Amino acid sequence: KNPKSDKFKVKRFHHIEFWCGDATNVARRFSWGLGMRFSAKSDLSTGNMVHASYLLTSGDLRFLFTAPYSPSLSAGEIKPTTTASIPSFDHGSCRSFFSSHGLGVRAVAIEVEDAESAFSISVANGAIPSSPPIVLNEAVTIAEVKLYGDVVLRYVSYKAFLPGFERVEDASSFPLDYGIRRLDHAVGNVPELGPALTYVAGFTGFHQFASGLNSAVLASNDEMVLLPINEPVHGTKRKSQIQTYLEHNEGAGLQHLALMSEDIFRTLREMRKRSSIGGFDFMPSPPPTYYQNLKKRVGDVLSDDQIKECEELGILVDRDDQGTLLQIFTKPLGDRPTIFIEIIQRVGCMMYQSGGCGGFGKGNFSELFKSIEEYEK
Amino acid sequence: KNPKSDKFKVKRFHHIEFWCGDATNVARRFSWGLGMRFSAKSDLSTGNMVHASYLLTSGDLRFLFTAPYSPSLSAGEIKPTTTASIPSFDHGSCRSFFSSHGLGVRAVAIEVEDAESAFSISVANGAIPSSPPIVLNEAVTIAEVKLYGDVVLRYVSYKAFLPGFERVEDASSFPLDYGIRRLDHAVGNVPELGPALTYVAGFTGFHQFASGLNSAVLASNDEMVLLPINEPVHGTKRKSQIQTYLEHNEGAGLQHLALMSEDIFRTLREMRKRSSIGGFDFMPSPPPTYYQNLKKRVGDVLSDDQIKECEELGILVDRDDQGTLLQIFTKPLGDRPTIFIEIIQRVGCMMYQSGGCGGFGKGNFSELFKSIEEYEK
Ligand SMILES: Cc1c(C(=O)C2=C(O)CCCC2=O)ccc2c1n(Cc1ccccc1[N+](=O)[O-])c(=O)n2C
Ligand SMILES: Cc1c(C(=O)C2=C(O)CCCC2=O)ccc2c1n(Cc1ccccc1[N+](=O)[O-])c(=O)n2C
Ligand SMILES: [Co+2]
Ligand SMILES: [Co+2]
């Protein structure tokens, strides 16, 4: 069931913004590790005396990395005279965020028809305001409401990246590409799922999309904006990884970003080649009992050779009634065991491909455990 | 002249420690960009609940990257019970440093015969204490005194990296190597050169080793520990880059690290290949008038082919009465126009090679300017 109850018109994920201590080093690491092109900037060299912001793109996926400069550089500025290209930016908020949580996501940005309307309707429906709608260069409108923890849901709307960003000159813009194409879903960890769901569904109208954690997925009308949320389950034998996150992150925040690849085998080969030379490490592969049991469950979908590819790369496979999901998880992106990335590819539900096709892999919790035991034998 | 007036016995540069917001991302970026191997760690996985520290090595060069975890992870600890592997580490000091200066060098570490003696003699001779000598695992002694700004001179002595660091398992330790072998000199920017010199020479006994800036070099008895210091010169037509540094860094700090390569041509080819794909950008090359005028000044030392190599790579050349210096400068290492790296190779003064052979390139200030004008023509 899909009541299509969005309170305003939502398009697609637009970008994810990381709040960093040094945006340069994080952006260069991510660029190399994920195969994303350096495509736009806003920093001292473009007249921004407030923050350094670097945009990486791969397909439709936009990763923005932002850090504050010395406040002394902009001490004479006021909000009407600011040289910041993102008017919601605040030195104190950014420094507090990063010292409290370490590296992680500040903003999940979705494009909407009308960001002013999206904000007012959201706030009228319980959203906690974070940054009021501001029209940039009479061309783009930006507004922010609290999502969970210190993460904000950012609305962006275009009359026709952002004003005051410059496109990067081609000599500095190496066209890296490992096959990642768009953001599939963005997942938050909170201490209590119930109140988090009620708040977010309450101001968006997003509907509930149909071990250590309880989880639920909120989705927009066409189910292309997918926002899962997790809570811990206490009292279990192994400690909840959601609780571990909350402890190391100092509370609620973004847990993982799932990135859709147009060729997850190519993506994972390219990423794994680079893990030890500046890129991203992947979680421990599951035992071969998992791949032995794969013929049975997805021999329908994947050939023996394509299943061989999965075992080499550590790809996990899940399947619901509609489609098939291939997935794998990176180790944490930074110092703390908090935010990680998921690489994703979905098979099925062709109409374009409908959103969430194949689910989110929760079948892989049981299959993994079972596979571990059958491997011990 | 070399009065050999060290007040304690100094060996070699031991390591440079960066204070970061996220040590993981900086270390992975530097590893890839400089060709340094990931060789040791101290973090959650080794029982350190206080800070994450990752060591990169290339030859004798040791770069350490450190960031604080959430203080809540170690809130029950006291200094006698600390799980920090570097006992001088302090959450508040590190967060203050990084939010004030951004990414940069906290510690210039030199190995000494006796770090307890080095500290006491230093403090008896005017050094401002920063961290008292602490003996780690009855094997290594560590102590710190203020150098300039919030940079400390760290003394390390070994009875026979540090206790509580683990060597990295080989699957995670890719043997990158672009030819960098050791730290040649480490340079500070201060507002006033005179008082800075008097302080540091005063507690070390280091002797003065024989445009926008005034500069002087302090050196140990065998002139292998080289600590140049710069001050700005105000009133010039172009603004002093030393003053720019002081403004963006919020005061005195480390300006550049000069890294000796056993093959600067190989190093720069390897680094330049990686600039746009996660590595380091280099400063704008000087005009061809510089390379045309190179035969005349160093045709003695470098063949036409080796001079061709210099023009391709942007290498600068200087020469004093004793030796020849090849050098090139990176763009800033992070968001702020503050700290950068210099790649270095020295030709001459064979005995081993005596320290500082060829000087530090100050002849290249005039040669560069001249070369610019002769290029305009
Ligand atoms: C997070 C996750 C997903 C997943 O993507 C997801 C959603 O997108 C919304 C629905 C709830 C959900 O779990 C799917 C399968 C999983 C899994 N995890 C946990 C995990 C794995 C690697 C690193 C950290 C963590 N961790 O700390 O939880 C796991 O073991 N299996 C088998
Ligand atoms: C720092 C420097 C050195 C140098 O290494 C050095 C020492 O090791 C101790 C003696 C004083 C000294 O200058 C040598 C030649 C130089 C130079 N600079 C400035 C520079 C260059 C690139 C990026 C930033 C800056 N900058 O901001 O100054 C320059 O133009 N030329 C020709
Ligand atoms: Co997921
Ligand atoms: Co130098």
Side-chain angles (χ1 to χ4, degrees), chain A residues 2-137 139-166 168-236 239-289 291 293 298-307 309-321 323-369 371-372 374-375, chain B residues 2-137 139-166 168-236 239-289 291 293 298-307 309-321 323-369 371-372 374-375:
Chain A
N2 178 0
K4 292 192 158 128
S5 50
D6 287 353
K7 298 189 158 84
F8 43 87
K9 288 331 282 161
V10 168
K11 297 171 94 199
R12 301 283 180 268
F13 281 123
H14 190 264
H15 65 271
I16 293 302
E17 176 178 14
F18 289 83
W19 265 2
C20 308
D22 186 79
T24 297
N25 278 264
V26 181
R28 299 212 164 194
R29 195 287 187 101
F30 274 61
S31 179
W32 178 234
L34 287 154
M36 305 181 66
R37 180 172 208 174
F38 180 26
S39 55
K41 68 181 177 167
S42 173
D43 63 2
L44 292 168
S45 84
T46 71
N48 184 341
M49 305 298 117
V50 175
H51 57 90
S53 289
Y54 302 112
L55 181 72
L56 302 187
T57 61
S58 189
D60 294 336
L61 178 60
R62 301 184 187 89
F63 276 2
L64 182 63
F65 303 83
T66 301
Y69 292 124
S70 174
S72 62
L73 302 192
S74 61
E77 306 188 359
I78 55 166
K79 283 193 176 188
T81 68
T82 186
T83 56
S85 52
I86 297 159
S88 63
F89 183 86
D90 182 85
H91 292 281
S93 308
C94 187
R95 292 204 149 85
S96 285
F97 182 100
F98 191 78
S99 91
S100 161
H101 314 295
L103 171 66
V105 173
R106 169 59 171 182
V108 180
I110 57 168
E111 182 183 3
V112 297
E113 192 157 86
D114 186 345
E116 198 167 293
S117 178
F119 172 94
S120 64
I121 300 177
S122 294
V123 169
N125 282 269
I128 302 174
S130 192
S131 180
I134 296 143
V135 181
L136 309 171
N137 199 34
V140 186
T141 295
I142 172 59
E144 297 173 19
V145 304
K146 300 191 170 181
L147 185 64
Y148 34 67
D150 299 327
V151 185
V152 305
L153 183 64
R154 168 180 286 156
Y155 304 131
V156 53
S157 66
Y158 293 82
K159 173 121 71 145
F161 177 62
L162 291 179
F165 278 75
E166 296 184 12
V168 165
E169 275 320 306
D170 263 333
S172 314
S173 190
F174 196 105
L176 294 171
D177 179 11
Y178 312 161
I180 298 171
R181 287 298 174 266
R182 70 181 186 90
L183 178 70
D184 181 272
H185 53 269
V187 178
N189 282 346
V190 300
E192 314 194 314
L193 177 62
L197 280 182
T198 306
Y199 168 70
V200 177
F203 75 77
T204 59
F206 291 171
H207 61 273
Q208 185 146 351
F209 180 98
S211 186
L213 78 180
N214 293 320
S215 190
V217 181
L218 288 175
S220 60
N221 280 356
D222 61 14
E223 309 187 311
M224 296 270 78
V225 167
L226 304 165
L227 296 170
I229 310 185
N230 312 315
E231 81 180 336
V233 173
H234 305 114
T236 66
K239 194 199 188 175
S240 165
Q241 300 192 99
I242 316 299
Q243 180 62 27
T244 296
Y245 176 103
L246 293 174
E247 285 164 7
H248 285 260
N249 199 67
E250 295 188 5
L254 196 143
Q255 180 207 49
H256 69 279
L257 302 164
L259 318 179
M260 182 165 280
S261 175
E262 60 159 32
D263 185 349
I264 186 174
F265 294 108
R266 187 174 141 255
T267 297
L268 255 61
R269 290 191 302 266
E270 288 284 36
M271 292 190 69
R272 280 185 173 285
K273 274 199 273 228
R274 296 172 169 83
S275 299
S276 296
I277 52 160
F280 294 93
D281 300 343
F282 289 90
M283 288 299 283
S285 277
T289 39
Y291 294 105
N293 312 8
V298 293
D300 191 338
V301 193
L302 304 168
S303 78
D304 305 312
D305 270 355
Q306 284 148 19
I307 297 155
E309 278 250 63
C310 283
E311 181 172 48
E312 315 190 276
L313 303 166
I315 303 184
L316 287 77
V317 190
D318 202 26
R319 203 180 174 165
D320 64 11
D321 50 342
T324 299
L325 169 67
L326 320 164
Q327 54 176 178
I328 195 183
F329 303 94
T330 75
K331 287 198 176 179
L333 307 185
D335 292 333
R336 309 189 182 189
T338 54
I339 184 174
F340 54 94
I341 277 174
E342 180 191 8
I343 305 303
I344 235 52
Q345 184 154 37
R346 300 185 177 280
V347 193
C349 325
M350 292 308 292
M351 308 265 148
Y352 68 100
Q353 176 170 67
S354 77
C357 181
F360 299 85
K362 291 194 263 187
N364 272 319
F365 284 94
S366 55
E367 283 318 318
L368 254 176
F369 200 9
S371 184
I372 282 180
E374 331 180 352
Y375 165 69
Chain B
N2 178 0
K4 292 192 158 128
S5 50
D6 287 353
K7 298 189 158 84
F8 43 87
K9 288 331 282 161
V10 168
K11 297 171 94 199
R12 301 283 180 268
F13 281 123
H14 190 264
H15 65 271
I16 293 302
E17 176 178 14
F18 289 83
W19 265 2
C20 308
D22 186 79
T24 297
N25 278 264
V26 181
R28 299 212 164 194
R29 195 287 187 101
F30 274 61
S31 179
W32 178 234
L34 287 154
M36 305 181 66
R37 180 172 208 174
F38 180 26
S39 55
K41 68 181 177 167
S42 173
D43 63 2
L44 292 168
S45 84
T46 71
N48 184 341
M49 305 298 117
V50 175
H51 57 90
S53 289
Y54 302 112
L55 181 72
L56 302 187
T57 61
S58 189
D60 294 336
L61 178 60
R62 301 184 187 89
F63 276 2
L64 182 63
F65 303 83
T66 301
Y69 292 124
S70 174
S72 62
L73 302 192
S74 61
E77 306 188 359
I78 55 166
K79 283 193 176 188
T81 68
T82 186
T83 56
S85 52
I86 297 159
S88 63
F89 183 86
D90 182 85
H91 292 281
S93 308
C94 187
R95 292 204 149 85
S96 285
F97 182 100
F98 191 78
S99 91
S100 161
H101 314 295
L103 171 66
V105 173
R106 169 59 171 182
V108 180
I110 57 168
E111 182 183 3
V112 297
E113 192 157 86
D114 186 345
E116 198 167 293
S117 178
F119 172 94
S120 64
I121 300 177
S122 294
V123 169
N125 282 269
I128 302 174
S130 192
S131 180
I134 296 143
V135 181
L136 309 171
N137 199 34
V140 186
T141 295
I142 172 59
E144 297 173 19
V145 304
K146 300 191 170 181
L147 185 64
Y148 34 67
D150 299 327
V151 185
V152 305
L153 183 64
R154 168 180 286 156
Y155 304 131
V156 53
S157 66
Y158 293 82
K159 173 121 71 145
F161 177 62
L162 291 179
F165 278 75
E166 296 184 12
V168 165
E169 275 320 306
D170 263 333
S172 314
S173 190
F174 196 105
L176 294 171
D177 179 11
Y178 312 161
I180 298 171
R181 287 298 174 266
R182 70 181 186 90
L183 178 70
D184 181 272
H185 53 269
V187 178
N189 282 346
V190 300
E192 314 194 314
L193 177 62
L197 280 182
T198 306
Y199 168 70
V200 177
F203 75 77
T204 59
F206 291 171
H207 61 273
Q208 185 146 351
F209 180 98
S211 186
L213 78 180
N214 293 320
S215 190
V217 181
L218 288 175
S220 60
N221 280 356
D222 61 14
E223 309 187 311
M224 296 270 78
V225 167
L226 304 165
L227 296 170
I229 310 185
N230 312 315
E231 81 180 336
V233 173
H234 305 114
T236 66
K239 194 199 188 175
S240 165
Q241 300 192 99
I242 316 299
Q243 180 62 27
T244 296
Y245 176 103
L246 293 174
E247 285 164 7
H248 285 260
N249 199 67
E250 295 188 5
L254 196 143
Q255 180 207 49
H256 69 279
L257 302 164
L259 318 179
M260 182 165 280
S261 175
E262 60 159 32
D263 185 349
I264 186 174
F265 294 108
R266 187 174 141 255
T267 297
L268 255 61
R269 290 191 302 266
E270 288 284 36
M271 292 190 69
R272 280 185 173 285
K273 274 199 273 228
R274 296 172 169 83
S275 299
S276 296
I277 52 160
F280 294 93
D281 300 343
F282 289 90
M283 288 299 283
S285 277
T289 39
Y291 294 105
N293 312 8
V298 293
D300 191 338
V301 193
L302 304 168
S303 78
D304 305 312
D305 270 355
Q306 284 148 19
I307 297 155
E309 278 250 63
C310 283
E311 181 172 48
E312 315 190 276
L313 303 166
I315 303 184
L316 287 77
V317 190
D318 202 26
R319 203 180 174 165
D320 64 11
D321 50 342
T324 299
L325 169 67
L326 320 164
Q327 54 176 178
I328 195 183
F329 303 94
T330 75
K331 287 198 176 179
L333 307 185
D335 292 333
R336 309 189 182 189
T338 54
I339 184 174
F340 54 94
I341 277 174
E342 180 191 8
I343 305 303
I344 235 52
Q345 184 154 37
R346 300 185 177 280
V347 193
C349 325
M350 292 308 292
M351 308 265 148
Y352 68 100
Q353 176 170 67
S354 77
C357 181
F360 299 85
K362 291 194 263 187
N364 272 319
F365 284 94
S366 55
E367 283 318 318
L368 254 176
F369 200 9
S371 184
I372 282 180
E374 331 180 352
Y375 165 69

